[PDB]
């Protein structure tokens, strides 16, 4: 009965709900407010899942990207000065690319990053940006904005779309007479 795969979410309804919150566009002043609110909550939720353990790399990367984008567009003395936002983007991006490439690799000695990248179907632009971002002088804000958004959509067509449709009286030993065996979690 090896058909046991552990996930950190409670069930499929929780997983789908989060997906909805991240991408209101496909799933579908006050309107913008509500959207921002939901996105914040979604990010928080994903963070919790990460702590719990055993969370798909794609979900993590998605969370990161949305976090950066959300931070960037924030009026009200919270625009992070400029250099911060550029860092947030670079971090999320580098992690995302490194993850994908490392995962789909062979167990030979030293096969090249570009080869693997092409084989999986990842645009060479992303790989190039990754190499540049880490070593050769942190990218400009505009380039990061574009790359981030493209990355998000690509992720959607790679992972998330395959997850469904698109619509001392303080301690009292529990009474050994009115108890019924229920699984762990449910009340």
């Amino acid at each position: 009965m090896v058909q046991y795969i552990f996930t950190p979410w409670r069930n499929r309804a929780e997983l789908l709900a989060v997906r909805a919150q991240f991408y209101p566009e496909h799933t579908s002043f006050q309107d913008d407010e509500h959207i921002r609110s939901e996105k914040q909550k979604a990010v928080a939720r994903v963070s919790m899942w990460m702590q719990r353990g055993g969370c798909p790399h794609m979900v993590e990367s998605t969370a990161l990207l949305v976090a950066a984008i959300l931070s960037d567009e924030a009026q009200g003395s919270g625009a992070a000065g400029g250099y911060a936002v550029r860092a947030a983007y670079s971090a999320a991006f580098s992690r995302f690319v490194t993850g994908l490439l490392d995962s789909h690799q062979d167990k030979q000695r030293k096969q090249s990053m570009y080869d693997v990248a092409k084989a999986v179907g990842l645009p060479a632009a992303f790989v190039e940006l990754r190499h540049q971002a880490t070593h050769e002088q942190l990218p400009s804000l505009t380039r990061l904005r574009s790359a981030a958004r493209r990355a998000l959509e690509w992720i959607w067509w790679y992972y998330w779309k395959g997850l469904g449709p698109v619509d001392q009286s303080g301690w009292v030993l529990y009474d050994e007479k009115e108890w019924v065996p229920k699984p762990i979690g449910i009340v």
Partner: protein, 528 residues
């Protein structure tokens, strides 16, 4: 009778009576014995896995799991032995119905223990190692022992690179120092204390907990055959434990060293009167932060002798260690050989799973084979007053949380009951007030509760939180006997929730039991 070769050797007349085996051997004879069995020598001298037994000694229960190096029994001249069957082992055996991993770990026969001969008595689709003591190891042990007998209470600091034999060697040291009985016209068995500073794969403790243990009888059993010990004659008792909620201390060095200090302090106090050596085994790092930790540990503890089980180790770590070791005025540092499957992860998991099934009370400790789901949880209240509520609150280590997330985040994981000794612990935290939401104790800093002021009272598994309409409460299950639980007034009791590596085995366990003996299980996704 019973002839074979290459692994064991011939015995002689083996008289089976009432379920036990009386075997006579009139020459040096060595034989392996897989299973669960009690030894009670009648005449002569037998050496079993490090401990020498003679006529005037109580029965010793030995568990020999097919996973590790099966203990070998060597008898020195014309002796008669009586091998008894183990009772409590049957309870442990039944645990195989709740997780297939415990299935292939014992004698695949009928009785509790089956003698092993040449090559064909082995179980199917599984190899069968054997404990063998290198000449160096044995000689070194002899040297330490003779020095010890003409000195006070030595402290042996054992360390070295991963999978080298640190644990095994420690086992030997403990058993031999305890049981030795040289020229004194034997004696009695001199007690021995063990300090386990290995959160990763502990001993005499569940994973994720550091602890100090006091041993009276020999330790002839793996870690997953005695994780919890009767808190507070009795064989093995536990002095003090601390919850370092991780499986790799490299998340908060300060707390780790602090814990080390507190435990060693207590050791100092008790050791001072009745002379008792202390054997401490470290996690096992060589590069990075770990090496630094090892250095600091050597500095704080100031061990009498340091044993590095590598002899071909990296020059950087050996050098660094030698510098630190040399620094504390003088400290003998000697290197010893080593020797080159079940990964640490699975072993750790087994330890944890075993712990929760421990029954709430030669024998050592019974096991209750009924699944966790079927048990009756403890119903703790949450809206009371700060003195008649039960749990004082919930603290979090290395990671905070927003209010809404907390209920879903905590539920399901493993936590630890932490008893506050002196009020000087929660000084600085905004302790909740009587007043519906979980009494989360905000801790912006991140650092854990000071070790000098709080102690662990055994891990706790949450199985359900229902805080609605008018009665906030938690349903939690623990192995801790009711006696201790009731005697704490509720005010002095905080709940710590950290990492611990989510008890994945727990959820599935119910399903396995139901299927083997012969539905919207949260977190577990069935592949249909």
């Amino acid at each position: 009778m019973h002839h074979s070769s290459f692994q064991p050797n011939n015995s002689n007349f083996q008289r089976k009576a009432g379920g036990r085996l009386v075997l006579s051997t009139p020459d040096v004879e060595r034989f392996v014995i897989l299973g669960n069995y009690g030894v009670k020598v009648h005449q002569g001298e037998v050496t079993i896995a490090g401990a020498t037994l003679t006529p005037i000694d109580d029965v010793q229960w030995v568990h020999a799991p097919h996973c590790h190096a099966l203990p070998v029994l060597r008898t020195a001249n014309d002796t008669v032995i009586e091998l008894l069957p183990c009772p409590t082992a049957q309870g442990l055996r039944e645990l195989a119905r709740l997780n297939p991993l415990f299935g292939r770990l014992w004698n695949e026969t009928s009785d509790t223990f089956q003698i092993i001969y040449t090559s064909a008595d082995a179980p199917k689709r599984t190899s069968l190692r054997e404990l063998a003591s290198h000449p160096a190891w044995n000689k070194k042990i002899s040297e330490l022992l003779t020095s010890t007998r003409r000195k006070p209470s030595p402290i042996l600091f054992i360390c070295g690179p991963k999978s080298s034999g640190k644990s095994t060697f420690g086992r030997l040291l403990t058993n031999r120092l305890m049981t030795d009985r040289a020229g004194h016209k034997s004696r009695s068995w001199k007690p021995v204390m063990v300090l386990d500073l290995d959160p990763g794969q502990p001993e005499f403790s569940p994973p994720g907990v550091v602890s100090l243990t006091k041993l009276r009888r020999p330790n002839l059993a793996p870690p997953f055959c005695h994780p919890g010990l009767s808190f507070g004659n009795e064989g093995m008792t536990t002095v003090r434990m601390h919850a370092i909620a991780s499986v790799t201390p490299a998340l908060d060095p300060a707390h780790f060293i602090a814990c080390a200090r507190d435990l060693f302090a207590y050791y100092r106090r008790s050791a001072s009167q009745e002379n008792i050596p202390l054997v401490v085994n470290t996690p096992g790092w060589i590069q990075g932060t770990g090496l630094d930790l090892l250095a600091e540990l050597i500095a704080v503890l100031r061990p009498t002798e340091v044993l590095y089980m590598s002899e071909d180790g990296p020059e950087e770590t050996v050098s660094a260690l030698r510098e630190a070791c040399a620094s504390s005025s003088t400290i003998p540092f000697t290197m010893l050989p080593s020797q080159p499957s079940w990964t640490p992860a699975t072993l750790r998991s087994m330890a944890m799973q075993s712990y929760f099934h421990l029954s709430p009370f030669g024998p050592g400790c019974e096991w209750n084979p009924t699944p966790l789901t079927h048990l009756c949880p403890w119903r703790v209240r949450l809206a009371g007053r700060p003195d008649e509520r039960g749990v004082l609150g919930i603290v979090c280590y290395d990671h905070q949380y927003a209010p809404e997330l907390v209920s879903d985040a905590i539920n399901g994981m493993v936590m630890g009951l932490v008893r506050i000794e002196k009020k000087e612990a929660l000084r600085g935290l905004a302790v909740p007030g009587d007043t519906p939401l979980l009494p989360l104790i905000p801790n912006p800093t991140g650092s854990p509760l000071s070790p000098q002021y709080t102690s662990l009272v055994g891990l706790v598994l949450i199985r359900g939180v229902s805080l609605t309409a008018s009665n906030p409460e938690l349903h939690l299950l623990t192995p801790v006997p009711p006696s201790v639980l009731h005697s704490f007034r509720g005010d002095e009791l905080v709940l710590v929730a950290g990492k611990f590596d989510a008890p994945t085995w727990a959820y599935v366990e119910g399903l396995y039991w139901k299927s083997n003996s012969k539905d919207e299980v949260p977190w577990v996704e069935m592949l249909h």
